Structures are given as C-alpha cells and as structure tokens.
A = this chain, B = another copy of it.
C-alpha cells in the first residue's frame, strides 16, 4: 500500500493473476508443498497479514486509507486466492468476529466490520462456496453475534437476490439452515437489544419473504413457533418507532395464511399496535401535521395490507378504524380501495370475508347501534356491488336462513331500549337482500 504502485508492483500483478488460474485449474497444491494441513497456513497468514493487518496501519495511527482501487482488487485477489484452499473458512468463521474498534475520517467502527463490509462482494461471491457451514457458527456454534451476524445477511441479500449467473435455488438451500438456525436467535431476546439489532432482524425478515419465495415458507417450513412468535414479539417492541413499525407491518400480510390458533395473537398484537399508536379520537386533525402525515401513511398501509392479505382478520381490524367516526376525515381510500379488493377475489375468499363481517354483525355482544350499522353499510354492502357472479350463490346459501330467522317473530326489548339493535339487524338484512336482489335474476 503506497506511492510506487505506478512503477514497482507489476511483479505482483504477475503473481495474483497467475496463481488464481492455476487453482481454477486445481493445480496449485502441487505448485506449493502443503506445510502441515489441506490449509497451506501461509494462506491463512496472508489473510491475517498480507491484508488483515496491512489494511489497518494503526501503529503510526495516521488515518485509515481510502484505498488506491487497483490495490483493493488485487488484495481481493489474495482473498479469492485464499478461498482456493482447504480449511480456510474454519479460521474466517472466527476472523470475522473482531471487536477492535477502528479510530479511523476519525469516526469509529469495528475492524471485523470494516473488513467484511469492505470485502462484501469479495467474500459474498466466494465464501458462498460454503453455504451455511459458517451460518451455523454465526448463530449457533457460537453466540449469535450482537451485530454483524445479521449484516452478513444484508451483504448476502444483495448477491443471493441478484443471483441467476449459472446458479439458483439460493433462497431454498439457505432457508432450511437459516430457519433451523433461527431457533438459536437469542441476542435479540435481550429487551434492550439495540435498535441496530432490531433493524437487522427486521431487514432480514423482509429479505426472507423476498429470497425464500413464500411457497418455501408456506405452512411449517421455517418453524413458526420460533420465527413468527419472534416477529410478533418484534411488533410488540415499545421502543420500535412507527416508520419501522411501518416496515414491520409491511411483512405482516404473508402471515395471514395461518389457520392455526397462532393467528389469535396476530389479531391481538395488531389491536395492541393500532390502539396504542393511532388516535382514539381521530377527529383532531386537519391535513399537514406529522401527527396526521405519518398516520395517513399508516392508514393506507393497513389498506395495502388488506389488499395483499385478502383477509377477514385485516377486514376485522379495519372495521374498528373505518367505523372510528362518521366522516373520519379520510373515507375515500377505505371506500375506493375496497373496489380493488372485491374485484380480483376468487369466490371462496369473498365468501369468507363477507361471513366474518356478517358473523361480527350477528354477534349479540353489547356494542352501539351505530357500530352494528356501520359494519353492515360502511363495509358489508360496500363489498357486494363490485365482484363477479358466484359471489351471490355461495354466500346466499350461508346467510339467508340464518338472517330471515330473526326477521320473522322478534320485536321486544323496548323495555330496557336496546331495541335499536333489533331494528338495526332488521334493516341490515333488508339492505343485504337489497344488494343481492339488485343482481338476482
């Protein structure tokens, strides 16, 4: 590393090219006699001390170099050349893990960080010849590291998500290890695990449903008792702030696939989230204050979440916010978005949607007659214009007997005067019948 590279390191441009080819040809373990193991230990020391110490001239403590770029790629050539050889990664799987903070610029970060993060593509095209046989150590065959174990997957999910260059299945082969190994994700389980480690496992989980195409996270593929309960306890973080909550909920939707009682807390955590965060009185806001501006992003994001999930559980949550008042000052999105969600639905989906709001409307539970009418008019009827045919014949053949049975003989409770609930059911049914009989031949 120095000024005469323009004049005197052609002697190294010679070597670095040559030896690489010789071990692309596999010959190089006859071109040097192996001293003690299938690792030529010189190769490990070249990592350690052609570069891992020479990248950091911390003896005179004159500032950490922005490399002369040719010298970066030949030093990457030494690293690449190191991966020509046996046993190498069995030191790297510790040589990553370096705590020494570089007093660089002059702002601080780790030498193991600087190394990995500089040599990201270098490692992250070539370490990959090993898949999980360091991920194993990274999570489990040592404590899942306080930080970078995860930045490993950030630098990974550039290239692995890029990867079609004569190889693929990257996510599939990854998944089956990184899920078993996700069992052992424990340093996050410190309450005060930094916003850094929260952000890491967050960005990772996004990039899971990205690389591990959800056909490969379908039912039990990654262990939901580990990885989903982890995501729920991530959403439940009260130090996790609302833009990052915003990404977190942006990967809720795929989990609306759960039929299990594991979904029970998916409603409760989203109830707990929105009720603590979003305004118990929404009437407060005219447009333009952050209190509103980042709230309307969250509002539209719950409608995106509905549009993706095709879910009666998101429908159910959404009823508590769309019915927050008459003229909650946004209504246009909650109305116009439903036009999109009712269009594409394959018939059994909307049969389930409608029944959740019907069952909700049917439930005798003490709640206001506004709240019962709003669910029918401001949502249930508001689904029944838009769709194809067959959305009639199925859903009809559920509700209409279980509806008309109430109409035909029940007329009391003027006496305590919740009677407005009886009649709200009765008009709810006439309005149910109205939309279907507008379509029934």
Contact = CB atoms under 8 A, between A and B. Distances in A.
Contacts of A368: 366, 418
A365 interface: yes
A364 B415 CA distance: 17
Contact of A412 (B271, B274, B363, B421): B271
Contacts of A367: 366, 416, 418
Interface in A371-426: 371-372, 412-416, 418, 421
A366 B366 CA distance: 3
Interface string A250-287: 00000000000000000010010011000000000000
A275 B366 contact: no
Interface in A30-50: none
Contacts of A323: 416
A418 B366 contact: yes
A320 interface: yes
A366 B421 contact: yes
Interface of A: 268, 271, 274-275, 317, 320, 323, 363-369, 371-372, 412-416, 418, 421
12 contacts: A268-B412, A274-B415, A275-B414, A275-B415, A317-B415, A320-B415, A320-B416, A323-B416, A363-B364, A366-B366, A366-B369, A368-B418
Contacts of A413: 365
Contacts of A412: 268, 271
Interface centre among A364, A414, A415 (most CB of B within 10 A): A415
Given A364-B365, A364-B366, A421-B366, A371 B271 contact: no
Contacts of A415: 271, 274-275, 317, 320
Contacts of A418: 365-368, 371
Nearest to A323: B416
Contacts of A421: 365-366
Nearest to A276: B414
Contacts of A364: 363-366
Nearest to A415: B320
Contacts of A317: 415
Given A366-B372, A366-B418, 19 more contacts: A268-B412, A275-B414, A275-B415, A320-B415, A320-B416, A323-B416, A364-B364, A364-B365, A364-B366, A365-B366, A365-B413, A365-B418, A365-B421, A366-B366, A366-B367, A366-B368, A366-B369, A368-B418, A371-B418
